[PDB]
PDB file of C-alpha atoms in Angstrom:
ATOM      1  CA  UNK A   1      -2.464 -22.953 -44.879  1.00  0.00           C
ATOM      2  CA  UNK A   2      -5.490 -25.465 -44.032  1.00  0.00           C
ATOM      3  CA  UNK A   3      -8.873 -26.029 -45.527  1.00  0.00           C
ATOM      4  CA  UNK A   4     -10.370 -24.267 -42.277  1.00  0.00           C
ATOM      5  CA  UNK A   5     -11.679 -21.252 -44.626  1.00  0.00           C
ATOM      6  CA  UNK A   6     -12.957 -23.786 -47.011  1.00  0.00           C
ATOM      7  CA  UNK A   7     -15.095 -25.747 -44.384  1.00  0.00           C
ATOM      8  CA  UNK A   8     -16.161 -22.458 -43.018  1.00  0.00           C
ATOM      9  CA  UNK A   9     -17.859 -21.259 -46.456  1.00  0.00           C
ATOM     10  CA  UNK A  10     -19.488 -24.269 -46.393  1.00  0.00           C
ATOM     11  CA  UNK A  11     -21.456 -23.759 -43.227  1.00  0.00           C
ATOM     12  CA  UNK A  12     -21.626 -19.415 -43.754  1.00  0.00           C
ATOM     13  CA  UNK A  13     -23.767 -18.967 -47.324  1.00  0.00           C
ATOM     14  CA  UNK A  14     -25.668 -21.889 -46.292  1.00  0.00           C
ATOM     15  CA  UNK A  15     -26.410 -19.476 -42.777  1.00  0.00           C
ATOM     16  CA  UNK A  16     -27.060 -16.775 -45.257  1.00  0.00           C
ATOM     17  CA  UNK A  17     -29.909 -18.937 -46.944  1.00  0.00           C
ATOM     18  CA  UNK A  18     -31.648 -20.064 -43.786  1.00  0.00           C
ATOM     19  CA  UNK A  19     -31.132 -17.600 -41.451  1.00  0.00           C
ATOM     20  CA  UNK A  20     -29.793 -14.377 -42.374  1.00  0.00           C
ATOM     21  CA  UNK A  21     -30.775 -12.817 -39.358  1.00  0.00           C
ATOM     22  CA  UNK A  22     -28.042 -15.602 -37.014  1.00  0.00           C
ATOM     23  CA  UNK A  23     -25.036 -14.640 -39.380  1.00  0.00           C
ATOM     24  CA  UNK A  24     -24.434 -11.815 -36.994  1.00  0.00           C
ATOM     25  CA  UNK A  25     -23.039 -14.362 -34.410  1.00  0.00           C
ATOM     26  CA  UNK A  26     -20.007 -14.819 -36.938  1.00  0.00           C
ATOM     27  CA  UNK A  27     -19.149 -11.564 -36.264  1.00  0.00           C
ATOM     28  CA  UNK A  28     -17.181  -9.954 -33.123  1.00  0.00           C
ATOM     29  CA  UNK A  29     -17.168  -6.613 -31.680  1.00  0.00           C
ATOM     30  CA  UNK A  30     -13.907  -5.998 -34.375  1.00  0.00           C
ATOM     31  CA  UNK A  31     -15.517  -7.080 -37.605  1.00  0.00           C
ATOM     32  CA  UNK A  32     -15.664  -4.904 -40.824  1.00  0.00           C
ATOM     33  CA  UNK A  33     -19.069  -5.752 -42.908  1.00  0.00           C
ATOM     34  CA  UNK A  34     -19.158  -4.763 -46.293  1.00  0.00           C
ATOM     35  CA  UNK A  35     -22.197  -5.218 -48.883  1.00  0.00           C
ATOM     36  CA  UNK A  36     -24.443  -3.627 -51.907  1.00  0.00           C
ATOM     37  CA  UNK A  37     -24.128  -0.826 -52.040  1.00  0.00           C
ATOM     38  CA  UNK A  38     -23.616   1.045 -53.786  1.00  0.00           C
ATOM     39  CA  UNK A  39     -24.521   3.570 -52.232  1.00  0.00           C
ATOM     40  CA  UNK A  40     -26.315   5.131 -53.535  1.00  0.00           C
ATOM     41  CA  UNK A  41     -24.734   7.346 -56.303  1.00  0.00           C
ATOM     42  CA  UNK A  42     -22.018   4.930 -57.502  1.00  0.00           C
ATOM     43  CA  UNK A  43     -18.926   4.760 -55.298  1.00  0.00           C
ATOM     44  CA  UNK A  44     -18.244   1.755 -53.363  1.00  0.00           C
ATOM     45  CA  UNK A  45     -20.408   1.819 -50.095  1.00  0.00           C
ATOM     46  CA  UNK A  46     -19.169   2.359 -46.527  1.00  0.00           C
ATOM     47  CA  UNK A  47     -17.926  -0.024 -43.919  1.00  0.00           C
ATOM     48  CA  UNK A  48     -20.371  -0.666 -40.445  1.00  0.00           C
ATOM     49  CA  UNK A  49     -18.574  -2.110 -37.359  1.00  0.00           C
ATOM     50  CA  UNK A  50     -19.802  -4.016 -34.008  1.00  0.00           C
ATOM     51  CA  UNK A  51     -22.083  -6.956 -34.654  1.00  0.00           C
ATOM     52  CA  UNK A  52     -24.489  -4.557 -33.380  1.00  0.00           C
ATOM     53  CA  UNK A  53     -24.454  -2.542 -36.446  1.00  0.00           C
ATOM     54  CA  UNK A  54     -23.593  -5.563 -38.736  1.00  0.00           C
ATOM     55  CA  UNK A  55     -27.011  -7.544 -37.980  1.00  0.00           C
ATOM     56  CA  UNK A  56     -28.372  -4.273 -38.731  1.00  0.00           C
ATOM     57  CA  UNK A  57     -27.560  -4.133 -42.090  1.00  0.00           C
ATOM     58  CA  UNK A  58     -27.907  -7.714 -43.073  1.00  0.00           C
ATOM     59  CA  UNK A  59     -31.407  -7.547 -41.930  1.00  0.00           C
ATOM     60  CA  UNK A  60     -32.044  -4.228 -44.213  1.00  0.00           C
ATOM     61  CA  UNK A  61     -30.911  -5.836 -47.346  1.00  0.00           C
ATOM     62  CA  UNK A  62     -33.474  -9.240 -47.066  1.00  0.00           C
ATOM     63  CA  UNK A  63     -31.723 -12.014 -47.649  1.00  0.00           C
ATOM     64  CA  UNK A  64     -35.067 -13.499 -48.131  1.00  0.00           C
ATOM     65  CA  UNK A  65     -34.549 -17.312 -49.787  1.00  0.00           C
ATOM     66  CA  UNK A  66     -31.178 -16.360 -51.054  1.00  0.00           C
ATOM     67  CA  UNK A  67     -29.939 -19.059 -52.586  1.00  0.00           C
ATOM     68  CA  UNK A  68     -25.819 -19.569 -53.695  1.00  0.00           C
ATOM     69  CA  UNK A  69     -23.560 -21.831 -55.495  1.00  0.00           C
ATOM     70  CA  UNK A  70     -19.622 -20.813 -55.115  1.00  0.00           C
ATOM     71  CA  UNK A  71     -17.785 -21.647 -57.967  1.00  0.00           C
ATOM     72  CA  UNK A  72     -14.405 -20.805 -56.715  1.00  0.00           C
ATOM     73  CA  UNK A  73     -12.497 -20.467 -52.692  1.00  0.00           C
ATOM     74  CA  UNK A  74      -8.967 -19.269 -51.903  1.00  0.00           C
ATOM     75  CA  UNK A  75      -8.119 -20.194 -48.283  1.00  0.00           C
ATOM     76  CA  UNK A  76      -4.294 -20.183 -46.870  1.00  0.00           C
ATOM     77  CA  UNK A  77      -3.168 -18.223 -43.974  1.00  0.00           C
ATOM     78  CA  UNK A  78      -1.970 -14.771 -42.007  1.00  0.00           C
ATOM     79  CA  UNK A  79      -0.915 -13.747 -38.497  1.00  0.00           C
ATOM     80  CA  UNK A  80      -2.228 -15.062 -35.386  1.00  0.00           C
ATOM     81  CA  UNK A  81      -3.081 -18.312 -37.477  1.00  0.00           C
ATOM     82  CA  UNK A  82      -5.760 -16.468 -39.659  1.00  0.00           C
ATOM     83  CA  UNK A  83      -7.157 -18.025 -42.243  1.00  0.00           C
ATOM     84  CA  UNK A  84      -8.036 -15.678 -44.820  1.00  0.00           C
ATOM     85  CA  UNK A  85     -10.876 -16.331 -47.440  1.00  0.00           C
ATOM     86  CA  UNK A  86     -11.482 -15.135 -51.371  1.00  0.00           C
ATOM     87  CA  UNK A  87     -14.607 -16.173 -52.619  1.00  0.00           C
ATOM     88  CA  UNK A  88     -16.155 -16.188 -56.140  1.00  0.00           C
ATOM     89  CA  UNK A  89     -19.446 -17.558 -57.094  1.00  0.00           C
ATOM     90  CA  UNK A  90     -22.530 -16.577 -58.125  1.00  0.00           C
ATOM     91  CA  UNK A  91     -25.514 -15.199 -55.731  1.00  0.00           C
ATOM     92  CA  UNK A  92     -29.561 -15.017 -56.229  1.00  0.00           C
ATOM     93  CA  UNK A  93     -31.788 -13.197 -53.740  1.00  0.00           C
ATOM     94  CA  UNK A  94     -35.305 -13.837 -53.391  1.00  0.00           C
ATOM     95  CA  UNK A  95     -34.794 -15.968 -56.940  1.00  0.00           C
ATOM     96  CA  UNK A  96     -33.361 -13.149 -58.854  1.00  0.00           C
ATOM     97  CA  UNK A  97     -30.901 -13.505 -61.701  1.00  0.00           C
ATOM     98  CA  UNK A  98     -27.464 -14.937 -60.610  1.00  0.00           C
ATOM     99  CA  UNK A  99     -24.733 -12.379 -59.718  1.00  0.00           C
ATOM    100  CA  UNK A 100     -20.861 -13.096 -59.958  1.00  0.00           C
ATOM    101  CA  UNK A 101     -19.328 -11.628 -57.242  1.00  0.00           C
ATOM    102  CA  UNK A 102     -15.873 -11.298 -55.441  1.00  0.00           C
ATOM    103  CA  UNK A 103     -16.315 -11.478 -51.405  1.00  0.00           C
ATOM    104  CA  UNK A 104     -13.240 -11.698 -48.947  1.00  0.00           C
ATOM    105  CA  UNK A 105     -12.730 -13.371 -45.675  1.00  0.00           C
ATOM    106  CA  UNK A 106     -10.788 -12.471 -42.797  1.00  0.00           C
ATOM    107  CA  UNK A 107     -10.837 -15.304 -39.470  1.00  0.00           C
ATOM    108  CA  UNK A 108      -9.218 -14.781 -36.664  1.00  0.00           C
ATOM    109  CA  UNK A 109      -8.847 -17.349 -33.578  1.00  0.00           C
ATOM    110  CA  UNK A 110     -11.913 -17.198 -31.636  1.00  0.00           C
ATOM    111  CA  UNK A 111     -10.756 -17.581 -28.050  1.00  0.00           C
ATOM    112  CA  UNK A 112     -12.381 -21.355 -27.496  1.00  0.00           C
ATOM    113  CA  UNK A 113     -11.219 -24.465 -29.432  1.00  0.00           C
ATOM    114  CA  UNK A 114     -10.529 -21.854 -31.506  1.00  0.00           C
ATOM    115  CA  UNK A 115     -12.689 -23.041 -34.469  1.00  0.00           C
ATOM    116  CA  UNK A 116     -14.292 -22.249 -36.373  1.00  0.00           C
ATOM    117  CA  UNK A 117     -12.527 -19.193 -35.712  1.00  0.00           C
ATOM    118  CA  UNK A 118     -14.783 -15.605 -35.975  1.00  0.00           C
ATOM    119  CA  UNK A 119     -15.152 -13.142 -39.685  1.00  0.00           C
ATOM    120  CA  UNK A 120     -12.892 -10.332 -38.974  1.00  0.00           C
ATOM    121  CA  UNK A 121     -13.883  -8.722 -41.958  1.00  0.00           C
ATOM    122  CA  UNK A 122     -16.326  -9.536 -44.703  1.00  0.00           C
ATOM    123  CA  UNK A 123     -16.070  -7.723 -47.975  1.00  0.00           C
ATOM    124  CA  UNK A 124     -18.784  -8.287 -50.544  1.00  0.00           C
ATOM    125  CA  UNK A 125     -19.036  -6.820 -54.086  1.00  0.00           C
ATOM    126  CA  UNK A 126     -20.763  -7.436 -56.750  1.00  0.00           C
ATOM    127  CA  UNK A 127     -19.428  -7.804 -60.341  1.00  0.00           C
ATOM    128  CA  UNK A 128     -21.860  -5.579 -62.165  1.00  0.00           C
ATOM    129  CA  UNK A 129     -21.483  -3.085 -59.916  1.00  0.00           C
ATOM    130  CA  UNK A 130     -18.293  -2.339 -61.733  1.00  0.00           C
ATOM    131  CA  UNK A 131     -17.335  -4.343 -65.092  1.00  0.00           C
TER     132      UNK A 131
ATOM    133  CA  UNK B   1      -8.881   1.792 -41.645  1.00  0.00           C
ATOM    134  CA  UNK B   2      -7.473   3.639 -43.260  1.00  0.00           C
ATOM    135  CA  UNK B   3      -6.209   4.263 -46.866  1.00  0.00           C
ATOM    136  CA  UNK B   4      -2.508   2.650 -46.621  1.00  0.00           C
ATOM    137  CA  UNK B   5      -3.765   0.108 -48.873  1.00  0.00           C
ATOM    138  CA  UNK B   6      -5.160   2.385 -51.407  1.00  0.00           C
ATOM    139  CA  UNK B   7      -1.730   3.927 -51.573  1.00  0.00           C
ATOM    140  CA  UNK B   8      -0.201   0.861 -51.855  1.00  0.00           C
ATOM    141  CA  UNK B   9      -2.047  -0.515 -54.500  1.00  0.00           C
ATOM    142  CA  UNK B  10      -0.626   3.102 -55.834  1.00  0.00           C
ATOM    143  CA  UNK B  11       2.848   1.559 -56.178  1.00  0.00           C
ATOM    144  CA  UNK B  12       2.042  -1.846 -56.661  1.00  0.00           C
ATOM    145  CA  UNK B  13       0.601  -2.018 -59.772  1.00  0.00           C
ATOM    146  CA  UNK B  14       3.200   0.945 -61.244  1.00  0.00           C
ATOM    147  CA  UNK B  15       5.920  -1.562 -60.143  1.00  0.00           C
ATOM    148  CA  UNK B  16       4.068  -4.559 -61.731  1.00  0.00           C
ATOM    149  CA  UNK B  17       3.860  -2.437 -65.137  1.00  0.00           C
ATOM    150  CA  UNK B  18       7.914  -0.935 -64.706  1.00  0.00           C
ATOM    151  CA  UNK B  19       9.799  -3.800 -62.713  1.00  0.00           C
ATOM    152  CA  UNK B  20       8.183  -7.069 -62.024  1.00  0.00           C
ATOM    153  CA  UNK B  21      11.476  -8.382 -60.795  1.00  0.00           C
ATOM    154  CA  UNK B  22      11.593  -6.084 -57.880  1.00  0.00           C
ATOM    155  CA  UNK B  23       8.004  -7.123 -56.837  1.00  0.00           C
ATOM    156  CA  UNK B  24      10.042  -9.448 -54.589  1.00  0.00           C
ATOM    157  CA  UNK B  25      10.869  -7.169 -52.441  1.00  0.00           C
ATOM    158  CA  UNK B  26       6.999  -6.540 -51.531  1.00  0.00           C
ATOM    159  CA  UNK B  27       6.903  -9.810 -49.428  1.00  0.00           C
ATOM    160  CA  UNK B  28       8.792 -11.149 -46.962  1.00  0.00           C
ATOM    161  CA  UNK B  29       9.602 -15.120 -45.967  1.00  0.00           C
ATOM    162  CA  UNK B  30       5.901 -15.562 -44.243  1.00  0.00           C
ATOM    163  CA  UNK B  31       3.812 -14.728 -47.582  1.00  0.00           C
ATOM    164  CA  UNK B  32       1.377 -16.357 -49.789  1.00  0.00           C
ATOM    165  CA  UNK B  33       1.805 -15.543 -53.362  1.00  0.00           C
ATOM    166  CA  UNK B  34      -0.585 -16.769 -56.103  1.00  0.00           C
ATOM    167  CA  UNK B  35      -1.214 -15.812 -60.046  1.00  0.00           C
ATOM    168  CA  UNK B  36      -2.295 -17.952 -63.183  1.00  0.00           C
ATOM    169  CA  UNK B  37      -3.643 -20.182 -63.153  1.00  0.00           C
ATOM    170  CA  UNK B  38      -4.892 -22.465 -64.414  1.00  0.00           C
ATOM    171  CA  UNK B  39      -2.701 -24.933 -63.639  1.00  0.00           C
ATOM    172  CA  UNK B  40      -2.780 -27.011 -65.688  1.00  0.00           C
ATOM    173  CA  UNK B  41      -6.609 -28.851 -65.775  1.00  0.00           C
ATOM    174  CA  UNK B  42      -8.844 -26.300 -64.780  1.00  0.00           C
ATOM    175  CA  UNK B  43      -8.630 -26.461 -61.124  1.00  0.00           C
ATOM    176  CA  UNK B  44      -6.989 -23.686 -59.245  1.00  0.00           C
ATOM    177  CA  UNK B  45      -3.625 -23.053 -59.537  1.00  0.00           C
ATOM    178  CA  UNK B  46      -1.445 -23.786 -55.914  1.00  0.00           C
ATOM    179  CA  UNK B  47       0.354 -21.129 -53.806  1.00  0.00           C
ATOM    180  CA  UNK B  48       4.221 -20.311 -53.159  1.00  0.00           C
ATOM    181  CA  UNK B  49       5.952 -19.748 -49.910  1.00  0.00           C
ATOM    182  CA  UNK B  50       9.226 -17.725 -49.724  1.00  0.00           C
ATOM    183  CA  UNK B  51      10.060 -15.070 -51.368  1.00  0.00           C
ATOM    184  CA  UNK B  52      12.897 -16.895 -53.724  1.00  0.00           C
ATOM    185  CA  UNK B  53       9.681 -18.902 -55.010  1.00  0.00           C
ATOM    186  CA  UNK B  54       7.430 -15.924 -55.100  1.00  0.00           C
ATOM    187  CA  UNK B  55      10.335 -14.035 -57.394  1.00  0.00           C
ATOM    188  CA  UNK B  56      10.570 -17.270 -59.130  1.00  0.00           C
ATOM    189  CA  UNK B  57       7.099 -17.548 -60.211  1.00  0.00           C
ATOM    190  CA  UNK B  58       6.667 -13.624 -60.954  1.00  0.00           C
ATOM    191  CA  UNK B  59       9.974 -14.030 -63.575  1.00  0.00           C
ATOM    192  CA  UNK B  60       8.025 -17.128 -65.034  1.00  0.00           C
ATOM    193  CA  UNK B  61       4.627 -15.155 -65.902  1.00  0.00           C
ATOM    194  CA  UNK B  62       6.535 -12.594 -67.646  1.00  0.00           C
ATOM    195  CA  UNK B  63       5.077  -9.286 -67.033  1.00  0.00           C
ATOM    196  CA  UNK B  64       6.482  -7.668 -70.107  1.00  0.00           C
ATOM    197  CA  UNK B  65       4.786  -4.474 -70.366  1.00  0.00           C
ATOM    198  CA  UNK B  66       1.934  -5.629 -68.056  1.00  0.00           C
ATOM    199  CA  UNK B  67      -0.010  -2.522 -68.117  1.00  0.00           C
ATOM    200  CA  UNK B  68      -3.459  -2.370 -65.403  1.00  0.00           C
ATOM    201  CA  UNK B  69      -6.031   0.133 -64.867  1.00  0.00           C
ATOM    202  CA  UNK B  70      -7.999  -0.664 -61.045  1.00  0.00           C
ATOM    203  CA  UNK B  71     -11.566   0.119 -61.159  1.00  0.00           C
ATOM    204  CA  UNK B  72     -12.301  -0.719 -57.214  1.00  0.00           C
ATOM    205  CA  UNK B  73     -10.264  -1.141 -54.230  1.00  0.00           C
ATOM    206  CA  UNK B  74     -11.422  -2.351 -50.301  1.00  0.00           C
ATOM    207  CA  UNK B  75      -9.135  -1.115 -47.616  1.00  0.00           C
ATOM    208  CA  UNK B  76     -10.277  -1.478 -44.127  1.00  0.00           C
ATOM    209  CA  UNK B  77      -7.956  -3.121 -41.288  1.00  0.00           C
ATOM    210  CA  UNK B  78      -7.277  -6.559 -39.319  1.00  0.00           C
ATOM    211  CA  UNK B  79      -5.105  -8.063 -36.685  1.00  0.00           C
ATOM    212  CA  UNK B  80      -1.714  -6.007 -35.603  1.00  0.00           C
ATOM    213  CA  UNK B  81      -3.381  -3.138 -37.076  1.00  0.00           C
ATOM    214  CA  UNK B  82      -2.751  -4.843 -40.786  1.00  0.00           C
ATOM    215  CA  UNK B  83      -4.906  -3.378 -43.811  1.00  0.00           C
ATOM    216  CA  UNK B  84      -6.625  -5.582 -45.637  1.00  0.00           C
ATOM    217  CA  UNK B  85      -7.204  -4.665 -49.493  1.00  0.00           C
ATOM    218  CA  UNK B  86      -9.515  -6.379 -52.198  1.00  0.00           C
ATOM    219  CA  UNK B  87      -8.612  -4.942 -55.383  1.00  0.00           C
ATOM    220  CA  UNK B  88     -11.301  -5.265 -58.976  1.00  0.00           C
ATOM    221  CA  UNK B  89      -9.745  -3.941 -62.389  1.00  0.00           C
ATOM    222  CA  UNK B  90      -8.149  -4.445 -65.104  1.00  0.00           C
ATOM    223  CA  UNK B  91      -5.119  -6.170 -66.954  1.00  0.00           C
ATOM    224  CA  UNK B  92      -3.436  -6.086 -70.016  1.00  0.00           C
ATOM    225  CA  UNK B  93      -0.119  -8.473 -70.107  1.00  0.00           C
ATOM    226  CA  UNK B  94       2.368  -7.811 -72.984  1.00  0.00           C
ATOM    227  CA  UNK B  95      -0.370  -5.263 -74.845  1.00  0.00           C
ATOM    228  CA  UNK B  96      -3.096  -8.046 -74.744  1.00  0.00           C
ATOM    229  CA  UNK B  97      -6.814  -7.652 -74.141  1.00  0.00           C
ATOM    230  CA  UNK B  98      -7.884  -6.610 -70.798  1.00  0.00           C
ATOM    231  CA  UNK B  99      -9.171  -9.039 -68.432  1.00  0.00           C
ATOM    232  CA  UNK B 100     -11.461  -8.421 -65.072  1.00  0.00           C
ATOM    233  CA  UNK B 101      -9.590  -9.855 -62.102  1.00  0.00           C
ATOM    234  CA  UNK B 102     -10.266 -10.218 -58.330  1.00  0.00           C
ATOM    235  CA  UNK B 103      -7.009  -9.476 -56.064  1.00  0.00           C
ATOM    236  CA  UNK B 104      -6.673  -9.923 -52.332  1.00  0.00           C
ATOM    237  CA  UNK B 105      -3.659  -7.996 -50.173  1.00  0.00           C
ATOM    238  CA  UNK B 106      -2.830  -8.945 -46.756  1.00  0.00           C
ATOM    239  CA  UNK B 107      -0.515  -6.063 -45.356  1.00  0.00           C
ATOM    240  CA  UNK B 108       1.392  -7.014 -41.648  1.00  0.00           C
ATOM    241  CA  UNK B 109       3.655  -4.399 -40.104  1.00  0.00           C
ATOM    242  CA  UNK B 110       6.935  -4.335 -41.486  1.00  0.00           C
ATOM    243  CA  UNK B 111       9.446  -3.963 -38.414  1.00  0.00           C
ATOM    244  CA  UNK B 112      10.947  -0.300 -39.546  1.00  0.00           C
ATOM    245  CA  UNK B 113       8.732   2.542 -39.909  1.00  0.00           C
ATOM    246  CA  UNK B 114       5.581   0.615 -39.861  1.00  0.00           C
ATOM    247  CA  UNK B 115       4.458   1.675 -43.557  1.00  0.00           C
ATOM    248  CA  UNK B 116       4.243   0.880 -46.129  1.00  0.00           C
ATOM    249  CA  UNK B 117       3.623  -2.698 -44.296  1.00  0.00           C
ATOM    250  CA  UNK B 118       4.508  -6.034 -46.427  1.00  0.00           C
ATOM    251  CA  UNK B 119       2.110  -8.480 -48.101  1.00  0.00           C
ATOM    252  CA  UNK B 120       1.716 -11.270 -46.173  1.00  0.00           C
ATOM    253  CA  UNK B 121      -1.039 -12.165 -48.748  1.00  0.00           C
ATOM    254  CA  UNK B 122      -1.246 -11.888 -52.523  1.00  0.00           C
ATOM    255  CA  UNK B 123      -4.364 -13.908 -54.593  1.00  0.00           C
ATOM    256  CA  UNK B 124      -4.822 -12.910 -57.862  1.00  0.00           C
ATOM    257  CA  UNK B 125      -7.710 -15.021 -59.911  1.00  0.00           C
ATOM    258  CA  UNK B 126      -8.930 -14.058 -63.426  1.00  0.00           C
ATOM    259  CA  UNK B 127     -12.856 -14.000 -63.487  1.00  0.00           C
ATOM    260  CA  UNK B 128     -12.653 -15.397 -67.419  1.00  0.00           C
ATOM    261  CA  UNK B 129     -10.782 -18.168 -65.501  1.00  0.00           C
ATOM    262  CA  UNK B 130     -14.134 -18.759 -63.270  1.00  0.00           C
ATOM    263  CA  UNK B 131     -17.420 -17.502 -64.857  1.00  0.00           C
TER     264      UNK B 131
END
């Protein structure tokens, strides 16, 4: 267990206020990228894979100016050396009302240096999407 | 992915409500097992290693009719073909008021049979704990 998770928020919602449209390079060809959704009735939304498919989402839901403050980061470790990641904070795109929500990392070893690592799997939900 | 998680959050849970003492027998000697907190200041509680201090901390919390009712669960897959699950409900320890949590599973292969798997993983954080 290492603070590699926690230095690794640091530097991803602070991609995800600048440039939305680079967080796809986080991603591999493996990753699972979950957010919304709902959608759109009101059961939890599907999962897209390749980074192909991931950038293609993230751009559809505008992440235009949206700003975050995490309140709360659980990183310790798996297999292969993965540090996995729960996060719980508060979110606010384009300047809307803050959101609690519950988002979970997975990193696996990239393949060089081998940090900081790649998302295996990003899980995002929001709170009042389920109370 | 697939839904081994959501199956396993199926017995989890029921075993967390029936016999918290054999909740043990869930994880094996490489997991990461965390409840609470707080403890004690407000910061985050830390995490146990082994499952003789997992058991020993799960005895100590007292699940005494610890009764839960999920509202959301995240099952998709990792590394070694694991199943990652992030679990959003409810919980009621000893008839008390319920309380929204956010739960993280890490599932690895088991050795025998291959389901249902092992957590490698278990953070559990209460949101009243984080606002």
């Amino acid at each position: 267990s290492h603070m590699v998770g926690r230095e690794f928020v640091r530097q991803y919602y602070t991609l995800l206020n600048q440039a939305p449209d680079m967080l796809h390079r986080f991603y591999g060809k493996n990753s699972s990228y979950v957010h919304g959704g709902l959608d759109s009735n009101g059961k939890p939304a599907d999962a897209v894979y390749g980074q192909k498919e991931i950038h293609r989402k993230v751009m559809s839901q505008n992440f235009t100016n949206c700003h975050t403050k995490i309140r709360h980061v659980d990183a310790h470790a798996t297999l292969n050396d993965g540090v996995v990641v729960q996060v719980m904070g508060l979110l606010s795109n384009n300047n809307q009302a803050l959101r609690r929500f519950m988002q979970t990392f997975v990193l696996a070893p990239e393949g060089s240096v081998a940090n900081k690592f790649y998302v295996h799997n990003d899980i995002f939900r929001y709170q009042d999407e389920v109370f």
